[PDB]
Design a protein around this nucleic acid. Sequence first.
RNA 1: GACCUGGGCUACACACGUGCUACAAUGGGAAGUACAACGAGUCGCUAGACCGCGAGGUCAUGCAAAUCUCUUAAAGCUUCUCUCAGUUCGGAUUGCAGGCUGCAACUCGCCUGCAUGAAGCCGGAAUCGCUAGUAAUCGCGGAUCAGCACGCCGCGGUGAA
Lengths: 78, 177, 83, 112
Amino acid sequence: SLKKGPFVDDHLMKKVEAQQGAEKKKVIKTWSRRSTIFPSFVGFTIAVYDGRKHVPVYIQEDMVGHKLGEFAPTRTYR
Amino acid sequence: NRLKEKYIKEVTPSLVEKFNYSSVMQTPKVDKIVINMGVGDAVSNAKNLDKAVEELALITGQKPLITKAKKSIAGFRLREGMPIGAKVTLRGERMYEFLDKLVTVSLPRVRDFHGVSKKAFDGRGNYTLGIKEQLIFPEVDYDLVDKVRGMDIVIVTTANTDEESRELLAQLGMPFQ
Amino acid sequence: MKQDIHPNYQPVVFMDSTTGFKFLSGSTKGSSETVEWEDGNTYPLLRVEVTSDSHPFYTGRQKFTQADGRVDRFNKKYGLKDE
Amino acid sequence: ARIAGVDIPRDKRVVVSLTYIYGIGNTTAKKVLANVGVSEDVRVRDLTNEQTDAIRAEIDKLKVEGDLRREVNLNIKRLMEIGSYRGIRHRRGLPTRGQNTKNNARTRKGPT
RNA sequence: GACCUGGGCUACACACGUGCUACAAUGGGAAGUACAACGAGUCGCUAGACCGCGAGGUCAUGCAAAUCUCUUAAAGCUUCUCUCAGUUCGGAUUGCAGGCUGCAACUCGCCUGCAUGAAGCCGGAAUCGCUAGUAAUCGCGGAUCAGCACGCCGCGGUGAA
């Protein structure tokens, strides 16, 4: 319930932008907690940070609604 | 059907163009399609082939066989005479209608969309282009299929070298990457 | 064809959700709607969602306002808020 | 068999017997009985063929299906097969807001 | 020793202690209809009005207090209802849609609506509290607090063997 639209920080935007007409980069080091996904963020490759490790994951177009917090499982049950 | 018409119209004189054949008999045709549900788990419980044959009977226009063993392997618990897999050959015009289904429907319904891998060489005109899933065909029932195994396809031509088979499959759809 | 022990087949004409290719054969069946003379006089009901042109391996890059349900499920509610 | 889907039984009145299918809570039932102009009728279902066909066609205006079960399955199939972290714990039945369970498995599996 | 970001104390193959809700007919569901006490209030409680299925949204009037609000209390009373079932009992679990404070509800807040509906028909051995406004049942207020209570502290209704 975030009735006034999505929420993505502006200190997430500042790594690269010129990968819009070219083949994208591989390094996206971040914190990857607060920001959700809205369709301008499709098909990148982000090192999602889980408190210890910026774990790399790339994007499908239907991995689209939830935040960057599904893909930082901080439990380590193995 | 479509694909004999393409051979008669466009495929053969373009072959005589791109390789300078001195006679029409030199042109390479297509012969077989071999399909192999390699189960390997009917030895554990025999009701695994009992639905592989059910799926192949829908996919093809035939029934498959049941393959023998010819060996006796200790690791997979094998002896002679063991039901393992199931061939389906294809000849005639059901070659071309099944290839029409392959070009149109099937090959664009797979995740990680790339079409056809370009390295299946074998030097001598045979592109074994396997299938990972089973849900690809239109005749697949979610209310019947459980396991997520896959198929085999052995395209067999009479072409000598793989430069020829690439041009044939380029003139027969086949979305290479 | 060896007798009685081969499965069912009828040369079913295709359709599509978009533009309707009508050329081919099939094996499975249904309730016949357009028995068509220009093709096999059979079922139409193989009505696949895929043209093999809709995928961007043949036609080109056409997905920006691609507007398909689950696509719009995010991109209409805040998608009106997007654009 | 019976009139829509399967098994609309008698011996109970209309808002009671219609609850028995996968897709009717109670608000759907009262709204569908309001869309025709009918009543409880009575404590045994003794409707007429006009009334049964009307309430048969009005349910068809909804998602009331046996594929509504398949609709739930494709919902959770969308859920569990992206990554998915919610699929790992979806099969272990803990909610997406968390419930922090070390003895609340007896709801689903009964680990005792 | 110190500063900051992100995570964790909220895990779960298990065993024990403490509480809440049921296993329905002295009951559930719908309608109409009365009576308390304590305390709190300035960036705090909201009168009225309009709209919404609702969580609520907007304009706004009183209030630094026997005056304005929290706030018209629930069990209560009268009619219908269901007719003994795993049930119009039960209400966990799960998809979808939301509302609110927070810069931000994935890890990890509360609440609403739709769809779902599991165990559970009074619980062995054993063991606990209580001698009358008590036990048993039912609501209400406060502390800490942006937000969050089945816990704690306090009050009042019906009223036993």
